[PDB]
Amino acid sequence: SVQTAATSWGTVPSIRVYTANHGKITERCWDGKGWYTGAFNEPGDNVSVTSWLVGSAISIRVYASNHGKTTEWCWDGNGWTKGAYTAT
Amino acid sequence: SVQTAATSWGTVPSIRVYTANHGKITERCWDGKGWYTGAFNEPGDNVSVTSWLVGSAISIRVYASNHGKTTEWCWDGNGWTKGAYTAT
Amino acid sequence: SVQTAATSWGTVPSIRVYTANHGKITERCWDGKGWYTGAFNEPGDNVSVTSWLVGSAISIRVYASNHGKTTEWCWDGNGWTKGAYTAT
Ligand SMILES: [Zn+2]
Ligand SMILES: [Zn+2]
Ligand SMILES: [Zn+2]
Ligand SMILES: [Zn+2]
Ligand SMILES: [Zn+2]
């Protein structure tokens, strides 16, 4: 009262699983060898994710919902940044 | 309870974020310039989504769950229609 | 609290809708003709899914959360097998 969101890309593939548990959203990564803890760590009770490739460059969008409000987080190769998404 | 589902397609990309809040599911859209409110509006407490391309034409399937029942909604270019999906 | 997750692949397309309801996760499938009940059946309150292709062969990963623990399930052509995923 655990909630997950998953995305994958490429043919290896790379997989990312985001878990919202105890008011925190964390990330677990698979790139073909084993699972490791990712850099994503934001407060939230709910999470959704989508991702796309531009050649070999991955872009991830994580929608983290905390206390009635939804924040979009972007991964575009170098660090997680807050996105332009708003609910209204 | 906010609960979201997201899908994306193409290289721009186009992103669709569906939010179930206060018994209603609404849609926000990104097509490369800015976020705008989509046409989708159906009752529901939970939402999932998947999409696929047929060349450049998008097909979206939204699964909206409301009061114990799941209804599929289809976007195939010209309007949201009710899908053939049943749970059993 | 019905909670769903969806994935699709190819041009037909094939669609898989996973539903967590009454402490069980079941699967409904569409391969171009009609909806039918799939072999996936595991205990759980929450579910997410991701899939990818290697040619026309589908690989599906289902993340089933039951009583605080998340188990990854793999479909790689011949049966559902437990995956290496751990939360930590
Ligand atoms: Zn707990
Ligand atoms: Zn909280
Ligand atoms: Zn509220
Ligand atoms: Zn309701
Ligand atoms: Zn249970």
Q: Do C46 and A2 touch (CB under 8 A)?
A: yes
B51 and chain A: CB distance < 8 Å anywhere? no
Sorted by where each starts, the structural domains of chain C and their CATH numbers stand as 3-82 (2.40.128.190)
Which of B51, B63, B69 shows the shortest C-beta gap to C17? B63
CA of A32 to the centre of ligand 5 (A): 32
Q: Experimental method for this entry?
A: X-ray
Query: Dihedral through CA A76, CA A80, CA A85, CA B3, nearest 10?
Result: 110
Q: Do C52 and A10 touch (CB under 8 A)?
A: yes
ω into A43 cis (within 30 of 0): no
Please report where in the chains the tokens 């609960």 appear, as a residue: B3
Resolution of the coordinates, Å: 2.0
In terms of Cα–Cα distance, which of C85, C45, C86, C81 is closest to C66?
Answer: C45
Chain breaks in chain B (C to N over 2.5 A) after: 1
Instruction: Give the span between the Cα atoms of B56 and C87, in whole angstroms.
Output: 38
- List of residues 6+ apart from A45 with CB closer than 8 A: A3, A20, A23, A65, A66, A67, B1, B2
Instruction: Give the span between the Cα atoms of B7 and B9, in whole angstroms.
Output: 7
Sign of the Cα torsion B73, B75, B80, B84 reads: negative
Q: Do B63 and C4 touch (CB under 8 A)?
A: yes
In this structure, are residues A18 and A4 in contact, taking their beta carbons and an 8 Å threshold?
Answer: yes
Number of Cβ pairs < 8 A linking chain A and chain C: 51
- List of residues 6+ apart from B78 with CB closer than 8 A: none
Ligand 5 ion: Cβ-proximal residues, 5 Å cutoff: C 23
